[PDB]
Tab-separated table of C-alpha atoms in Angstrom:
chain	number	residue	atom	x	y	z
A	1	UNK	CA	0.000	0.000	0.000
A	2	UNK	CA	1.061	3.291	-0.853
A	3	UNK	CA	0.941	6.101	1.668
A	4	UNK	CA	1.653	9.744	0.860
A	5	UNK	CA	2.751	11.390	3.929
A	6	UNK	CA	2.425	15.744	2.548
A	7	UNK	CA	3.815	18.393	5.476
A	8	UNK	CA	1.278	21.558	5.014
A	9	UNK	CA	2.511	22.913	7.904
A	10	UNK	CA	4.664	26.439	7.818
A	11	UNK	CA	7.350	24.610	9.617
A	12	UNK	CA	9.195	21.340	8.669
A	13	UNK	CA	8.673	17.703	10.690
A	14	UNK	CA	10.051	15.000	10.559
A	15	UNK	CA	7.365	12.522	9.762
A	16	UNK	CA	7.248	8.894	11.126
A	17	UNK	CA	6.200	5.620	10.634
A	18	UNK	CA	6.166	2.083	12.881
A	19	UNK	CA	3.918	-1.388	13.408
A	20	UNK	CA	5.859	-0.875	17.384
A	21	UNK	CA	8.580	-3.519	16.937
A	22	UNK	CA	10.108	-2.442	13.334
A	23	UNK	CA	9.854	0.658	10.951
A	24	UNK	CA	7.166	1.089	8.087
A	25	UNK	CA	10.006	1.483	4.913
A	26	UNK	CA	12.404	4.091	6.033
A	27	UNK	CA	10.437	4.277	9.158
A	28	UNK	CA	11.086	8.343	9.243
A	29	UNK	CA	12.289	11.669	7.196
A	30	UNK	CA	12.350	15.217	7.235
A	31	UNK	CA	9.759	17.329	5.287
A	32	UNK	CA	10.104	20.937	4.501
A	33	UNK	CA	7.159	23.202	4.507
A	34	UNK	CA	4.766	21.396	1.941
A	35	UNK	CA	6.999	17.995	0.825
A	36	UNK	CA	5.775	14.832	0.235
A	37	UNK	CA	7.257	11.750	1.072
A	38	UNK	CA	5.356	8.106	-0.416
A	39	UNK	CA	6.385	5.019	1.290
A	40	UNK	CA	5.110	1.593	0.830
A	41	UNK	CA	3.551	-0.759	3.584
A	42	UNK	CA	3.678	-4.016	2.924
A	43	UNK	CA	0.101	-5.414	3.287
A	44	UNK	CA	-1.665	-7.067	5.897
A	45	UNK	CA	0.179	-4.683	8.308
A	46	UNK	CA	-1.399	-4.744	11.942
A	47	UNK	CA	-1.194	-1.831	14.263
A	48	UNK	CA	0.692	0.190	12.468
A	49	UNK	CA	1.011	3.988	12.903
A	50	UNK	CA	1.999	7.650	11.353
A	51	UNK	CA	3.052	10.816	12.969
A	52	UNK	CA	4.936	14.212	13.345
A	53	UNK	CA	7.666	14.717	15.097
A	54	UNK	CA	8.835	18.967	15.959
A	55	UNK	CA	11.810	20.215	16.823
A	56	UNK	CA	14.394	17.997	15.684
A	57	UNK	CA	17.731	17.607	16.057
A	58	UNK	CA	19.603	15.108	14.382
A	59	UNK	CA	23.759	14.178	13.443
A	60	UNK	CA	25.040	12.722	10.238
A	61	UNK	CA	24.330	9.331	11.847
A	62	UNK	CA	20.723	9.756	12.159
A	63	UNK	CA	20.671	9.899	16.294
A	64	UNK	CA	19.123	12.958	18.253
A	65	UNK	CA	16.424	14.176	19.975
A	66	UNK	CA	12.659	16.166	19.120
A	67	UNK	CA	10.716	17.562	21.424
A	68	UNK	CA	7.345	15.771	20.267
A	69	UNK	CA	7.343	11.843	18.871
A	70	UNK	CA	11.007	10.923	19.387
A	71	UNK	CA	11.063	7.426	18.727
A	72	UNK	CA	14.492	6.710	20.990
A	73	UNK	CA	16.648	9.389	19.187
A	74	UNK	CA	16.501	7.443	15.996
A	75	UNK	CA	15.246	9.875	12.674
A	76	UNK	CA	14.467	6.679	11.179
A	77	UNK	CA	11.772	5.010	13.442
A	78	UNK	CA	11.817	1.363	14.559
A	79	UNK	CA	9.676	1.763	17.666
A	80	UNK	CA	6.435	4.436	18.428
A	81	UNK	CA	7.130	7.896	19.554
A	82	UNK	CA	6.922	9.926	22.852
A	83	UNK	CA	3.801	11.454	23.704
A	84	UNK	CA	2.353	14.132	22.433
A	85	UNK	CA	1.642	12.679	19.224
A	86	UNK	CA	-1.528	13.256	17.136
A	87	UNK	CA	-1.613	9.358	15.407
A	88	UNK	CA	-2.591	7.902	11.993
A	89	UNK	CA	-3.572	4.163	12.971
A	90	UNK	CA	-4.305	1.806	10.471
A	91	UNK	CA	-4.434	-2.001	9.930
A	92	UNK	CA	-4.479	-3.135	6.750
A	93	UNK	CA	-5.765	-6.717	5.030
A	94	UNK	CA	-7.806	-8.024	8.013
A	95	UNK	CA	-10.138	-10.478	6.382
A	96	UNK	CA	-10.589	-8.341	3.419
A	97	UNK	CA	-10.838	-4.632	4.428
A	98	UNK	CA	-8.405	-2.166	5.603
A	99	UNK	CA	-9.268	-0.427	9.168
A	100	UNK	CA	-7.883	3.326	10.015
A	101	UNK	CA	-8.791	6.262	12.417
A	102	UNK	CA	-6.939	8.833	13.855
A	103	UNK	CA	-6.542	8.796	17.656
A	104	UNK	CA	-5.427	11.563	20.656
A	105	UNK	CA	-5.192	8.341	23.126
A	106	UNK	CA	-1.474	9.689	23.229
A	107	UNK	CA	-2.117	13.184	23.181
A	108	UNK	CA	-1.801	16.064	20.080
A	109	UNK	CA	0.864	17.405	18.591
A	110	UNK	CA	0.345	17.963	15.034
A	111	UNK	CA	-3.444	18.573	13.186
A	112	UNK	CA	-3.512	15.696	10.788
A	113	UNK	CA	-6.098	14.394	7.896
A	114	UNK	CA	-5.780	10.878	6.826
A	115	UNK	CA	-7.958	9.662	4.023
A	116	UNK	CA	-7.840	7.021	1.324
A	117	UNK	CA	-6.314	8.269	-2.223
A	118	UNK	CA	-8.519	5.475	-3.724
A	119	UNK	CA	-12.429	4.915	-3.677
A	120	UNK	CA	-14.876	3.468	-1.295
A	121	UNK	CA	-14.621	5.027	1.879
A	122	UNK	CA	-13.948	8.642	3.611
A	123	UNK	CA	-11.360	10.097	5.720
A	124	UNK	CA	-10.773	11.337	9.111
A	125	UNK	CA	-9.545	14.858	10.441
A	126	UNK	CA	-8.232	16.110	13.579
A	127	UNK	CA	-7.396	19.667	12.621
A	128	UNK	CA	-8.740	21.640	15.673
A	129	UNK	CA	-6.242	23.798	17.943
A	130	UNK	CA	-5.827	21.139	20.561
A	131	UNK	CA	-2.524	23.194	21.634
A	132	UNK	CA	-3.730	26.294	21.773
A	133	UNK	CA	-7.256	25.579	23.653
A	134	UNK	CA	-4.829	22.709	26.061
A	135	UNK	CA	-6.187	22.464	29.742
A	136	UNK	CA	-3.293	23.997	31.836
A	137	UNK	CA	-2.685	20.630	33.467
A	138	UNK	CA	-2.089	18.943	30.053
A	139	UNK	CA	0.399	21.252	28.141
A	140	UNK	CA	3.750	20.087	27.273
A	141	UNK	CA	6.648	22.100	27.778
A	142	UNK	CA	8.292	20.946	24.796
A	143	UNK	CA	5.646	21.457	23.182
A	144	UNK	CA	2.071	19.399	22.177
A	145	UNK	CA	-1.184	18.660	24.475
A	146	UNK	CA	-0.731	15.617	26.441
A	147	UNK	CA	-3.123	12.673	27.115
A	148	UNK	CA	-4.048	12.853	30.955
A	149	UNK	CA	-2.533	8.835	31.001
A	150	UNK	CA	0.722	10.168	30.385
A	151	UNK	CA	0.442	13.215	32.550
A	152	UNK	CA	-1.745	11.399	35.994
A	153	UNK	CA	-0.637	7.510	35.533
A	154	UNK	CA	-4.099	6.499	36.862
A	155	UNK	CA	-5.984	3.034	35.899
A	156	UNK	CA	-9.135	5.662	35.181
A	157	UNK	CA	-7.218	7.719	32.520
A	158	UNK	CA	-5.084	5.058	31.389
A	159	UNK	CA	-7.830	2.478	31.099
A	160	UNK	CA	-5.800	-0.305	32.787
A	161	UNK	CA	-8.361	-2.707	33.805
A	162	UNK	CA	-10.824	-1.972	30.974
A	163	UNK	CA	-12.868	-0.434	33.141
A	164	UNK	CA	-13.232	3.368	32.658
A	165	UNK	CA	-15.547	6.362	31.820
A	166	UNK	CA	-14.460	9.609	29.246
A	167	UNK	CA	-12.909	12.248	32.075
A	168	UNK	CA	-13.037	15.755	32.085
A	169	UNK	CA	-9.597	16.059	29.978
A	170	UNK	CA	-11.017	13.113	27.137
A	171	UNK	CA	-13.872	15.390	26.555
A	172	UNK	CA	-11.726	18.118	25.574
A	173	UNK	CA	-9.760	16.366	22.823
A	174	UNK	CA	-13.291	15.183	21.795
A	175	UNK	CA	-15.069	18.189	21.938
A	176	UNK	CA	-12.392	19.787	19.544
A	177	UNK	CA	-11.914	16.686	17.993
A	178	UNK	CA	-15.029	14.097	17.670
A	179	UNK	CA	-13.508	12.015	14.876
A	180	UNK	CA	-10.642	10.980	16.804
A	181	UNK	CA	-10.111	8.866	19.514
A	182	UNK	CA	-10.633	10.904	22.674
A	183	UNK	CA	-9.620	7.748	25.342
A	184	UNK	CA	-9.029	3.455	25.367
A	185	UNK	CA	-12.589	2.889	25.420
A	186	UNK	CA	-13.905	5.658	23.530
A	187	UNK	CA	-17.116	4.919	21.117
A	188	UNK	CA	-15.014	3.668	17.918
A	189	UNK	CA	-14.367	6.457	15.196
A	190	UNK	CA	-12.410	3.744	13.002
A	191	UNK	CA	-13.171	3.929	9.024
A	192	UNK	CA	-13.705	0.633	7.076
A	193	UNK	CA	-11.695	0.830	3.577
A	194	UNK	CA	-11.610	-1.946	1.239
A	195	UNK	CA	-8.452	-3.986	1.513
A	196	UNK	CA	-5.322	-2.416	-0.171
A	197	UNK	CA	-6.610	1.159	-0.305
A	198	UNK	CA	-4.057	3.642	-0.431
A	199	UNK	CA	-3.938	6.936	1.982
A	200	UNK	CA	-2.284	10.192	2.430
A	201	UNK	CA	-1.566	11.823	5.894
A	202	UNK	CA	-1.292	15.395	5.504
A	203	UNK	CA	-0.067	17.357	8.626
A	204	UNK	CA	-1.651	20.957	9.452
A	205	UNK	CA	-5.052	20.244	6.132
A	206	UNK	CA	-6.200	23.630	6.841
A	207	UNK	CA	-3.520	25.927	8.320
């Protein structure tokens, strides 16, 4: 599957992508202000993900630091990112249909829209300004709008035992944001595709 990853933002990322244990093609890049960068996912991918990564430093070696999404100091991801990061999920090939949504379960960083390039289904958008609006308790220093898992390490935000309600701070991603996933056990936003679609992620759609 093909996905075009397009920075629309007025400042550059470095984009990511990772199934967790191993990179999705070059697993990572830096785009400029409005490059594109297609990769290919092999199919019948499971739990993999897409995101942006700010503030970026990185040596001729490929090892540094960002303030949003490192993934271990590595430009090219092999593992998922630090929180905040605004995330393109998707799981392609499951019994005949591809499966993506966009989730805030780890917090906001970026505004994102990931859609299909090909037909039969729509996309999903979390483009609201979930930094700027952030609850006090939940900005990041270096930047980004944390979850209130990462920030409070409770079983209620974190969803431990499967057992939890939305919270004051889940309703705030999902009052900016109702197409994404707000917490764990949040009512499903997930878009069927038909299997072997192929998507673009475009950072900052509208601004």
């Amino acid at each position: 599957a093909t996905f075009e990853i397009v920075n629309r933002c007025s400042y550059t990322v470095w984009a990511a992508a990772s199934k967790g244990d191993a990179a999705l093609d070059a697993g990572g890049r830096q785009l400029n202000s409005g490059e594109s960068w297609t990769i290919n996912v092999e199919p019948g991918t499971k739990g993999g993900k897409i995101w942006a990564r700010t503030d970026c430093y990185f040596d001729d070696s490929g090892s540094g630091i960002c303030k949003t999404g490192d993934c271990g100091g590595l430009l090219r991801c092999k593992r998922f990112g630090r929180p905040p990061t605004t995330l393109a999920e998707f799981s392609l090939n499951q019994y005949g249909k591809d499966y993506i949504d966009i989730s805030n379960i780890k917090g906001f960083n970026v505004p994102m829209d990931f859609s299909p390039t090909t037909r039969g289904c729509r996309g999903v958008r979390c483009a609201a300004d979930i930094v700027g609006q952030c609850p006090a308790k939940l900005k990041a220093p270096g930047g980004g709008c944390n979850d209130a898992c990462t920030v409070f390490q409770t079983s209620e935000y974190c969803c431990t035992t499967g057992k939890c309600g939305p919270t004051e701070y889940s309703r705030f991603f999902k009052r900016l944001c109702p197409d994404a996933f707000s917490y764990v056990l949040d009512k499903p936003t997930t878009v069927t595709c038909p299997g072997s679609s192929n998507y673009r992620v475009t950072f900052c759609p509208t601004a």
